[PDB]
Design a binder for this molecule. Structure first.
Ligand SMILES: Cn1c(=O)[nH]c2cncc(NC(=O)[C@@H]3CCOc4ccc(Cl)cc43)c21
Ligand SMILES: Cn1c(=O)[nH]c2cncc(NC(=O)[C@@H]3CCOc4ccc(Cl)cc43)c21
Ligand SMILES: [Cl-]
Ligand SMILES: [Cl-]
Lengths: 300, 305
């Protein structure tokens, strides 16, 4: 029993965190096998950030302009290349702590653990979701660039996010480990803004199923809804559309609790209309949307 | 920017988790130096749990009745003894991954990270507070016993909790690493209940300071209060009393934000009396009490381990 926002154990990722310095800029890098991945903006000074020409800035660097520190040991950089917005530094030592890993690009609504780091040293771990507007609501201070997001389903680390930037609203933007940004963001200090964010409907439904599994039913009602009527209502509260894929994904939770997906949708419609009336669901007075259907099954 | 419920990095503790099996029961153990610590109820059948005589149950076991597995390697148990509600299994190999550590007993209101484990394998990490009623609101399934709670202070892991039991309300009870329960709980399958809980006032104030640091100021007001008047309000709303020690601990956050502790108390009094009026603080519609003043300072300053 209980239901917490739970992160994956971070040890496998801690053993990969290094500090990358280029000139006056220092940030984090991810050391896997003989390559250190880090945001390409490590080659910029604050005066290069409006319209950096990364190819031009990079061609001017030699391997010895990149200082990589793993613990108290300096690694030797023997090659460098850029892939999209990530810089890949080939080093002369394979990381002995490299876990089994893969790089995965995630979709909005997906969750992952973030190991926030400064100067190549882990500070804490928390759970995040890729918002529908392609930002993450992280907790990152200056120096956190290069910190990564990951999942560890079945002993293999799937790296899905590398932190690059903080937007004016205090939310965060980054890339997958192939250096492709999530959303329409660019690694430039030009004016950028997070688009209007919305609630991850399929995750709210998964979390209502978690509440039923954990013994709470107060929010259920005798009604059902069509999928289209549900979407017409939910969109009025800035909820993401629920697709037939989402309905299918909620199938196992529906079978376990005995509550049809569209019957849970009718409960959600009523919660949006009424609020909670002084009650809570799984210790929350708001509808939680950063648990996926997969997370609920894993935790419950 | 941003403020998340953040756990300590768990790697130092992951390297200590092992699986302990005694007969049909399998749970987790913590392997530090040449000793594996686990709940003493690993030796009980469900019927023994109704009214266990742990000394009598233990004298019937040999070292070979405890199967300890660290990853895919079986450790050799060469001794066994009980300390309060923990069983200590001496093994023939010191854990090469033993971090610098200490065993500390925490007080209600203190937070810690929990590394939830099953079959000696870490599954998740989350941040908990020891409630005023000595329970923790954890997330634990069958097989999670022996999972531990900890903090990291510099490069030293301070182990403060070992999981033993789930209570009927779905909250959790356990011991420190010396086997002393937090709360009036016993390791027996007999009627037990979590007592009425209260809110950790000093932690709510710390989280209001975190909200101010992150730009959420709507709840600030021109008023101040006295510690006695505030405590009359805290008592009325099932909040823990705020002491001068709590006020002193919040000193740095008060100096940074420019909001005196009793000025923030006046904000909290108004929130208790009026609610949030449709608003949220740090994405919450409830007053959060599982961040200590130290957690707020640490998260807002980026301390690493
Ligand atoms: C400077 N800084 C903070 O104070 N809190 C941060 C949390 N995360 C990230 C950063 N920094 C950034 O966002 C940098 C500096 C500003 O401009 C840009 C523009 C583009 C890119 Cl890719 C990176 C950055 C942080
Ligand atoms: C059995 N079980 C679950 O289903 N979810 C659990 C989460 N945490 C703990 C346990 N288990 C317990 O509580 C066991 C079994 C029940 O009886 C008692 C009585 C006293 C003590 Cl010390 C331990 C236990 C879990
Ligand atoms: Cl995905
Ligand atoms: Cl402090």
């Amino acid at each position: 029993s209980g239901f917490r926002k739970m992160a994956f154990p971070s040890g496998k990722v801690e053993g990969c965190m290094v500090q990358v310095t280029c000139g006056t800029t220092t940030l984090n890098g991810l050391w896997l096998d003989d390559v250190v991945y880090c945001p390409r903006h490590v080659i910029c000074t604050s005066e290069d950030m409006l319209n950096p020409n990364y190819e031009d800035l990079l061609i001017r660097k030699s391997n010895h302009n990149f200082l990589v520190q793993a613990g108290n040991v300096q690694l030797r950089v023997i090659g460098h290349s850029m892939q999209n917005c990530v810089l890949k530094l080939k080093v002369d030592t394979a990381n002995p702590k490299t876990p089994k890993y893969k790089f995965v690009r995630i979709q909005p609504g997906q969750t992952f653990s973030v190991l926030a780091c400064y100067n190549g040293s882990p500070s804490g771990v928390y759970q995040c979701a890729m918002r529908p507007n392609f930002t993450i609501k992280g907790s990152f201070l200056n120096g956190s660039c290069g910190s990564v997001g990951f999942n560890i389903d079945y002993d293999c680390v799937s790296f899905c996010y590398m932190h690059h930037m903080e937007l004016p609203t205090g939310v965060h933007a980054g890339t997958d480990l192939e250096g492709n940004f999530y959303g329409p963001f660019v690694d430039r200090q030009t004016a950028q803004a997070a688009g209007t964010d919305t609630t991850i409907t399929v995750n709210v439904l998964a979390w209502l199923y978690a509440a039923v599994i954990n013994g709470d039913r107060w929010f259920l009602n005798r009604f059902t809804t069509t999928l289209n009527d549900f979407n017409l209502v939910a969109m009025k509260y800035n909820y993401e559309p629920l697709t037939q894929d989402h309905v299918d994904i909620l199938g196992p939770l529906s079978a376990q609790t005995g509550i049809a997906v569209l019957d849970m949708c009718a409960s959600l419609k009523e919660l949006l209309q009424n609020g909670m009336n002084g009650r809570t669901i799984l210790g929350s007075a708001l509808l939680e949307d950063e648990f996926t259907p997969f997370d609920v099954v894993r935790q419950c």
